[PDB]
């Protein structure tokens, strides 16, 4: 099947580094430079063999046609009110970017407010963050180009959608919050740096600061309100309390769910915002997470995990701040994770829980924390919500593996609350009744029971004849909950496949203890859990090794790449998207320094010893047995992925091709596709999304020789 030859790639055999006595050769270190002629030539040569392989067979075209037809359905976000107007995002179906609409009332005619599609020919300029002024009359929005994390903040007067001159540059990983006097907005920016800042550079991002922009002025006049010169990795995000009196600064260092919480009583400022604010360091450590919900005078309600791995609600009174004085408003649940909490209609709280990887929604009283109402939902996820303190209604969006979703609305002014369906779209061509979603719990190596969702056609025989697509992430306290994917359903319907999602450790499915169970010294638990998910699917008859594909992105790309090295005999195909492959150098680039909380950092001998055992780049090895080769592998990345710099995938594919690809027994392809004008994934235009899934499924189809079922 390999009618092509792997590109010749220079090996710098002098690139040797000592890691606590352990010598490590990095012959493809030169691929770390995205701008060199050598790296550019490498990328071109790789794409030259991958593209024809993916497009050779009719399958890619069949899949693309079907995806284009099925993904073409009206897509709405739930409504949200700002000032006296309602807003919502909407995509007629195949627009590259969804469009923001505005209407003066729910029954009123809607009009285009912000259409990102007209900002580029190919839909590569996307909205990335936004914030309306408290009165809803002004609007700030971030724009990212080519998928980069870099943002340019622009402004508009809402009435008439008038463009304002204000433009803020050097913005990345920024919060946006307007002071309630309507004078300006807080945001974050990084200092000037040598080289490019367009998403193609690998430069580490340090010294992020907090600024205040006065509307109607030049960015050069912005006020520096907080900075951490002796702590280059700290990032301070600002938000205003609901009453507009306090600026709450959440300081983060790394990716753990913990933050310092400082506050500034704006009324106490000597003469408005003129410099470094008079910060009161309420919580001055990284021992716990404190997420602002609302306040009533000096009594602040926070969602926290302080000595509560499943999260809970506490009230901290700024006038009697000692921990011994905090009140527990809504105690922690024994197993269910309190995901998020919102305050609406002054004294109501909307609590969203995660029960065995499915969302539940409840209304509670702010004063006592008592449960008032349960908003009924089918098995799935809450992916959208609106309703701030001054609002008197809520909107919430539900989705699942089989349904595109339902948007509900509830008028909270009514004495007898009655939630109603507000918007529900049906996708023609896919009959949800033909499929089934089951949740099972399988034992991992150490006996821990891991949840896994399996989606398949009703009535299939568990004879191991079906191709399967097993997905996982496993890290950063992220819970992988039910979501609607047309691309995956096409695999089920048109490729006769079985979909599976394993809720492995490292995630947040069972709180912080679940997260800790898949990080640092225990990172191997993630890989074991995932390998055991595969073993379960095989032993139970859903699939067989030769018919099994595993997929993951970012931390999930690391997951599947490691599994390929560790158990090549278990998988037929592996698709790793924008994955972290060099675990010894990840911290050196862009925002990679933040991931050390989940992975550790190679500067430590103890951490190095963990990392070296699973780092994909450092564990490529020909299988011992003569009848075992590596699975077919496809790595997907893009040239503007400044979240996980592409060098990770470049170095990994070079290594796979050299160590494994050259072996005579290796007949399964080991390929990479590097896209242009794209990044980590957020904001990717519809056209690119369609091309990507078409590539993924064509690779699977060709490698496993699966017949398309029309």
UniProtKB/Swiss-Prot annotation:
InterPro entries: AB_hydrolase_fold, Pept_S9_AS, Pept_S9A_N, Peptidase_S9_cat, Peptidase_S9A, Prolyl_oligopep/macrocyclase. The N-terminus is blocked. It is found in: Cytoplasm. Ubiquitous. Transmembrane segments: none annotated. It catalyses: Hydrolysis of Pro-|-Xaa >> Ala-|-Xaa in oligopeptides. Keywords: Acetylation, Cytoplasm, Hydrolase, Protease, Serine protease. The modification N-acetylmethionine is found at residue 1. The modification N6-acetyllysine is found at residue 157. Belongs to the peptidase S9A family. Cleaves peptide bonds on the C-terminal side of prolyl residues within peptides that are up to approximately 30 amino acids long. This is Prolyl endopeptidase. It comes from Sus scrofa (Pig).
